[PDB]
Ligand binder design. Sequence first.
Ligand SMILES: *[C@H](O)[C@H](C[C@@H]1CCNC1=O)NC(=O)[C@H](CC(C)C)NC(=O)OC[C@@H]1CCC(=O)N1CCC1CCCCC1
Ligand SMILES: *[C@H](O)[C@H](C[C@@H]1CCNC1=O)NC(=O)[C@H](CC(C)C)NC(=O)OC[C@@H]1CCC(=O)N1CCC1CCCCC1
Lengths: 303, 303
Amino acid sequence: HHSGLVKMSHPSGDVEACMVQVTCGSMTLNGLWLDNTVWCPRHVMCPADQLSDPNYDALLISMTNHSFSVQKHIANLRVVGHAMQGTLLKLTVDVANPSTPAYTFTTVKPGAAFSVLACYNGRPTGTFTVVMRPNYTIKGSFLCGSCGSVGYTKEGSVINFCYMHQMELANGTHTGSAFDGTMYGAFMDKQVHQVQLTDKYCSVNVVAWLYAAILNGCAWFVKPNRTSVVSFNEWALANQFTEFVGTQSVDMLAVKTGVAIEQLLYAIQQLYTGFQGKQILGSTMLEDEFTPEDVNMQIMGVV
Amino acid sequence: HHSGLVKMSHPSGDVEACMVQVTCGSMTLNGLWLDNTVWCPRHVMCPADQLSDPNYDALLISMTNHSFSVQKHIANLRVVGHAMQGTLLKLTVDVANPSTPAYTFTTVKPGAAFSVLACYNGRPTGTFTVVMRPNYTIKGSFLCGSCGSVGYTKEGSVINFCYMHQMELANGTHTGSAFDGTMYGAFMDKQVHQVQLTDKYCSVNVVAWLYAAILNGCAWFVKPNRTSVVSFNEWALANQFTEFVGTQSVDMLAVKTGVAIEQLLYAIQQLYTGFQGKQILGSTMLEDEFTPEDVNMQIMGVV
Ligand SMILES: *[C@H](O)[C@H](C[C@@H]1CCNC1=O)NC(=O)[C@H](CC(C)C)NC(=O)OC[C@@H]1CCC(=O)N1CCC1CCCCC1
Ligand SMILES: *[C@H](O)[C@H](C[C@@H]1CCNC1=O)NC(=O)[C@H](CC(C)C)NC(=O)OC[C@@H]1CCC(=O)N1CCC1CCCCC1
């Protein structure tokens, strides 16, 4: 029986209309064009021989407005100002994007999902959705030239930009910047080996997945036994789980199914020791890539 | 280690601009507006009391052009002609869609992937990618009102429309129509219980996934032992696998990794009996939802 759950991304058209190519000397990547501003990773200023130990402050001073080229491929924009904010460049152009959507900037938190528009040379090429891992990486699909690809969520008609792609880590995962210019996690935008924080199971997302299983008639793992939130969170710290924090979205699932959160916290502790040959929604391992919001929307039609 | 593989959909903007709402009496769903034509499922003509045993021929005769309303939400189109082709209606409107992309119509084959734009009331709400299963269903995410949502692939700038959503099966999976009006599989657009053909593992996609594992440095399952294509396909018929048919995309992966296809056919036969506690790209079961094309594009950057 299919759970009715897929990896669902927002329709990407609104963001496609904001994507541009930024070139600086021998370097090129993607930028995001909103109003009179173009955001892009600052290592577009770095020549290939200094990617390991860049001096971005000196690099920025060496630039003029004519050091940058901004092109929209799907118009050439004259750059009239340039500034650096953290790991991003803010270029000012003389044309406001006529397709600028209603938007804000936000930081995404571990366990939360967002949509990514992967672009190359200013051309959108694919879209997918990821969850911010507890170690502030994402399990993405990014190749050379993808930097400046953007991640976002959408509230109503308002796009909430939360990610701009910067780099691939040694374990194949990815990270980038929020639009305040801070890198997610402790990462730096330099091409050197960097310490990787341990990843964890996202407990709230595992709980959501188990509710999705109940909503599909799969509840063999549900017992009257209960583990309290405080008891589970002590257990989580010793077992590579995030501490559980309940939300209204989770409570809706408890109300719909009639299964208490603490019943699923107990089930998680037992299932972590092993599924014993049984499957939950086609899986023999805990799934934490679906949020409570995903389950409410895709299965219950609740937004 | 992350494989670098995600469920990747095409950017949906080109298709969002073609989506409309179609209303017929008390029924409403989505349509696809291309040139002067609007395609939509024919059961928009059915009142709720006849969804089990509809007479679409008599229903169509009872309609006039003014029986239909077509609205674009993200202009109201006057309907000037109506016709039925299989399980779809072809409405003719008096305005050509100014955002009509270059397009064709095609039928997708089992094992092949395509992008879906899920819409409600003519408003796109999400995008995801699915593989046509060997029993001509897809493992989608569709709720009431999603009918007329469209599936497509993209070759260059040309959109290849291949699916229009029609119904949910008893096991939670989904099916719909090609744009020649034929339903995928043996399914009928009536709200009755229908025979479900058995699903199968898509062997060519499993082979692609094992190549992706090798490309990520995971090759413990590779042995000098080989099973021929003809020998495997005899085995497949007795073990719920599709018969393997090689392609140029698969051959590229063999050339890149230096591992022969027949080596992976042997590995599949052994892995089908059990992973013996080991994992491949984070999984303890065979994965068939990634195509050879997905692996070539996402990992090797080859399109
Ligand atoms: C920008 O388009 C680019 C996106 C990358 C390319 C491959 N996949 C991506 O997501 N970003 C970069 O190339 C980064 C530029 C820096 C921040 C100045 N660097 C980066 O992503 O380096 C990836 C390399 C290659 C694999 C790996 O482990 N790794 C990490 C850096 C470091 C290099 C030296 C050896 C230890 C690891
Ligand atoms: C159109 O928007 C709609 C899309 C559906 C709604 C739920 N998810 C979807 O993908 N399509 C329909 O409602 C179909 C209309 C027919 C083709 C005239 N019917 C349909 O999808 O029926 C689904 C029902 C409910 C679950 C189930 O097993 N099933 C199959 C039909 C039949 C009904 C009678 C009892 C046995 C199963």
